[PDB]
Amino acid sequence: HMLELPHEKDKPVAEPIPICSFCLGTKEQNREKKPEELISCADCGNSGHPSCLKFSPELTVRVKALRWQCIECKTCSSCRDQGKNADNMLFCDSCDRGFHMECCDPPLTRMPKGMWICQICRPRKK
Amino acid sequence: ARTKQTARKSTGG
Ligand SMILES: [Zn+2]
Ligand SMILES: [Zn+2]
Ligand SMILES: [Zn+2]
Ligand SMILES: [Zn+2]
């Protein structure tokens, strides 16, 4: 399964809003007018079709297993703050958690060229 | 890689 952080496990989960914040469709109608279950933000309840969020099927399965925050609610999993600069918070390509570049270990100052994954998602070494 | 900023742009705002 996907590992949860201790602070995620016991947090309140917002009532989910049963329509997509991007296209205004319910689970019955994504942008292609096809059924598609929503992913919902645990902080504000805003939802999105995975297709409208531009998630792959593989990321979708993983995010559905976790306490996920929407793009606007995303807070850094290390310091727990938003901070003022949005091009500074990376989103993990394995679990979609946010981390400020400055909060990575070691800190980053430049964008990775390809995928980026957080320390939670990197496996333990032999 | 993605950031909050690129995700907003990718998904429409
Ligand atoms: Zn949608
Ligand atoms: Zn939210
Ligand atoms: Zn941080
Ligand atoms: Zn991750």
Side-chain angles (χ1 to χ4, degrees), chain A residues 2-83 85-123 125, chain B:
Chain A
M2 301 295 281
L3 208 67
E4 292 193 83
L5 297 175
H7 82 89
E8 296 167 336
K9 273 177 273 192
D10 289 301
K11 270 246 252 350
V13 177
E15 179 185 322
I17 297 156
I19 72 170
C20 178
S21 64
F22 301 97
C23 72
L24 301 184
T26 60
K27 71 189 191 76
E28 309 298 338
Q29 290 206 344
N30 61 15
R31 286 186 164 121
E32 300 177 18
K33 308 308 184 173
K34 307 243 173 66
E36 189 179 4
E37 291 306 318
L38 298 169
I39 287 172
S40 303
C41 176
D43 287 354
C44 76
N46 281 5
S47 299
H49 297 109
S51 54
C52 290
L53 281 156
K54 312 302 191 60
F55 288 169
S56 64
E58 290 83 6
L59 181 62
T60 296
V61 169
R62 296 160 82 82
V63 159
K64 284 183 174 169
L66 288 178
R67 186 185 188 281
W68 178 79
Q69 293 170 305
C70 71
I71 293 166
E72 303 302 317
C73 290
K74 200 85 73 186
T75 52
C76 178
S77 279
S78 176
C79 70
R80 323 287 191 64
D81 282 334
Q82 244 176 30
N85 199 345
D87 207 26
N88 260 343
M89 194 191 288
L90 297 161
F91 287 4
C92 176
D93 287 318
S94 162
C95 67
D96 208 46
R97 289 181 181 96
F99 286 83
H100 294 123
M101 283 174 198
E102 300 83 357
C103 291
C104 291
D105 177 19
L108 293 178
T109 71
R110 309 169 71 244
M111 289 291 281
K113 179 188 307 193
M115 289 170 64
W116 177 82
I117 69 171
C118 80
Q119 194 56 53
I120 308 161
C121 289
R122 291 173 154 266
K125 298 284 204 176
Chain B
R2 298 177 299 127
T3 61
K4 179 178 293 218
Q5 180 194 262
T6 71
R8 276 183 185 140
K9 177 172 188 165
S10 299
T11 59

Coordinates of all heavy atoms in Angstrom, one line a residue, chain A residues 87-91 99-104 106-117, chain B residues 1-3 6:
Chain A
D87 N 5.9 28.5 -7.7 CA 6.9 27.8 -8.5 C 8.0 27.2 -7.6 O 9.0 26.6 -8.1 CB 7.5 28.6 -9.6 CG 7.9 27.8 -10.8 OD1 7.4 26.7 -11.0 OD2 8.8 28.2 -11.6
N88 N 7.8 27.3 -6.3 CA 8.8 26.7 -5.4 C 8.3 25.4 -4.8 O 9.2 24.8 -4.1 CB 9.1 27.7 -4.3 CG 10.4 28.5 -4.5 OD1 11.2 28.1 -5.3 ND2 10.5 29.6 -3.8
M89 N 7.1 25.1 -4.9 CA 6.6 23.8 -4.3 C 6.5 22.7 -5.3 O 5.5 22.7 -6.2 CB 5.2 24.0 -3.6 CG 4.9 22.9 -2.6 SD 3.2 22.9 -2.0 CE 3.4 24.3 -0.8
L90 N 7.4 21.7 -5.3 CA 7.3 20.6 -6.1 C 6.2 19.6 -5.7 O 5.8 19.5 -4.6 CB 8.6 19.8 -6.0 CG 9.8 20.5 -6.5 CD1 11.1 19.9 -6.0 CD2 9.9 20.4 -8.0
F91 N 5.5 19.0 -6.7 CA 4.5 18.0 -6.5 C 5.1 16.6 -6.8 O 5.6 16.4 -8.0 CB 3.2 18.2 -7.3 CG 2.3 19.4 -6.8 CD1 2.7 20.2 -5.8 CD2 1.1 19.5 -7.4 CE1 1.9 21.3 -5.4 CE2 0.2 20.6 -7.0 CZ 0.6 21.4 -6.0
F99 N 6.4 19.5 -1.7 CA 7.6 19.9 -0.9 C 8.2 21.2 -1.5 O 8.4 21.2 -2.7 CB 8.6 18.8 -1.0 CG 8.3 17.6 -0.1 CD1 7.4 16.6 -0.6 CD2 8.9 17.4 1.1 CE1 7.1 15.4 0.1 CE2 8.6 16.2 1.9 CZ 7.7 15.3 1.4
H100 N 8.5 22.1 -0.6 CA 9.2 23.3 -1.0 C 10.6 22.8 -1.5 O 11.2 21.9 -0.9 CB 9.4 24.3 0.1 CG 8.2 24.9 0.6 ND1 7.8 24.8 1.9 CD2 7.2 25.7 0.0 CE1 6.7 25.5 2.1 NE2 6.3 26.0 0.9
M101 N 11.2 23.4 -2.5 CA 12.5 23.1 -2.9 C 13.5 23.2 -1.7 O 14.4 22.4 -1.6 CB 13.0 24.0 -4.1 CG 12.3 23.5 -5.4 SD 12.7 24.7 -6.7 CE 11.4 24.3 -7.9
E102 N 13.3 24.3 -1.0 CA 14.2 24.6 0.2 C 14.0 23.6 1.3 O 14.9 23.5 2.2 CB 13.8 26.0 0.8 CG 14.0 27.1 -0.2 CD 12.8 27.3 -1.2 OE1 11.8 26.5 -1.2 OE2 12.9 28.3 -2.0
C103 N 13.0 22.8 1.3 CA 12.7 21.8 2.3 C 13.1 20.4 1.9 O 12.9 19.5 2.7 CB 11.2 21.8 2.7 SG 10.7 23.3 3.6
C104 N 13.6 20.2 0.7 CA 14.1 18.9 0.3 C 15.4 18.7 1.0 O 16.1 19.6 1.5 CB 14.3 18.9 -1.2 SG 12.7 18.9 -2.1
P106 N 19.0 16.9 0.1 CA 19.4 18.3 0.4 C 18.5 19.3 -0.4 O 17.7 18.9 -1.2 CB 20.8 18.3 -0.2 CG 20.8 17.3 -1.3 CD 19.9 16.2 -0.8
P107 N 18.6 20.6 0.0 CA 17.7 21.6 -0.7 C 18.0 21.7 -2.2 O 19.1 21.5 -2.6 CB 18.1 22.9 0.0 CG 18.7 22.5 1.3 CD 19.4 21.2 1.0
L108 N 16.9 21.9 -3.0 CA 17.0 22.1 -4.4 C 16.9 23.6 -4.7 O 16.3 24.3 -4.0 CB 15.9 21.4 -5.2 CG 16.0 19.8 -5.1 CD1 14.8 19.3 -5.9 CD2 17.3 19.3 -5.7
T109 N 17.6 24.1 -5.7 CA 17.4 25.5 -6.2 C 16.9 25.5 -7.7 O 16.4 26.5 -8.1 CB 18.6 26.3 -6.1 OG1 19.6 25.9 -7.1 CG2 19.2 26.2 -4.7
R110 N 17.1 24.4 -8.4 CA 16.8 24.3 -9.8 C 15.8 23.2 -10.0 O 15.9 22.1 -9.3 CB 18.1 24.2 -10.6 CG 19.1 25.2 -10.3 CD 20.5 25.0 -10.9 NE 20.6 25.2 -12.3 CZ 20.8 24.2 -13.2 NH1 21.1 23.0 -12.8 NH2 20.8 24.5 -14.5
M111 N 14.9 23.3 -10.9 CA 13.9 22.3 -11.3 C 14.6 21.1 -11.9 O 15.4 21.2 -12.8 CB 13.0 22.9 -12.4 CG 12.0 23.8 -11.8 SD 11.0 22.8 -10.8 CE 9.9 22.1 -12.1
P112 N 14.2 19.8 -11.5 CA 14.7 18.6 -12.1 C 14.2 18.6 -13.6 O 13.1 19.0 -13.9 CB 14.0 17.5 -11.3 CG 13.7 18.1 -10.0 CD 13.5 19.6 -10.2
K113 N 15.0 17.9 -14.4 CA 14.6 17.9 -15.8 C 13.4 16.9 -16.1 O 12.5 17.1 -16.9 CB 15.8 17.5 -16.7 CG 15.5 17.4 -18.1 CD 16.6 16.8 -18.9 CE 17.9 17.5 -18.6 NZ 18.9 17.1 -19.6
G114 N 13.4 15.8 -15.4 CA 12.4 14.7 -15.6 C 11.5 14.7 -14.4 O 11.0 15.7 -13.8
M115 N 11.1 13.4 -14.0 CA 10.3 13.3 -12.9 C 10.9 13.7 -11.6 O 12.2 13.7 -11.6 CB 9.8 11.8 -12.7 CG 8.9 11.4 -13.8 SD 8.7 9.6 -13.7 CE 8.0 9.2 -12.2
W116 N 10.2 14.0 -10.6 CA 10.7 14.2 -9.3 C 9.9 13.4 -8.3 O 8.6 13.4 -8.4 CB 10.7 15.7 -8.9 CG 11.2 15.9 -7.5 CD1 12.5 16.0 -7.1 CD2 10.4 16.0 -6.3 NE1 12.6 16.1 -5.7 CE2 11.3 16.1 -5.2 CE3 9.0 16.0 -6.1 CZ2 10.9 16.2 -3.9 CZ3 8.6 16.1 -4.7 CH2 9.5 16.2 -3.6
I117 N 10.5 12.7 -7.4 CA 9.8 12.0 -6.4 C 10.3 12.3 -5.0 O 11.6 12.5 -4.8 CB 9.6 10.4 -6.6 CG1 11.0 9.8 -6.4 CG2 8.9 10.1 -8.0 CD1 10.9 8.2 -6.4
Chain B
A1 N 9.5 17.8 -14.1 CA 8.9 17.9 -12.7 C 7.7 18.9 -12.7 O 7.6 19.7 -13.6 CB 9.9 18.3 -11.8
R2 N 6.9 18.8 -11.7 CA 5.8 19.7 -11.6 C 5.9 20.5 -10.3 O 6.4 20.0 -9.3 CB 4.5 18.8 -11.5 CG 4.2 18.0 -12.7 CD 2.9 17.1 -12.5 NE 3.1 16.2 -11.4 CZ 2.3 16.0 -10.3 NH1 1.1 16.7 -10.2 NH2 2.6 15.2 -9.4
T3 N 5.3 21.7 -10.4 CA 5.1 22.5 -9.2 C 3.7 23.0 -9.1 O 2.9 22.7 -10.0 CB 6.0 23.8 -9.3 OG1 5.6 24.6 -10.4 CG2 7.5 23.5 -9.4
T6 N 3.0 25.0 -12.2 CA 2.8 24.3 -13.4 C 1.5 23.5 -13.5 O 0.8 23.4 -14.5 CB 4.0 23.4 -13.8 OG1 4.1 22.2 -12.9 CG2 5.3 24.1 -13.6

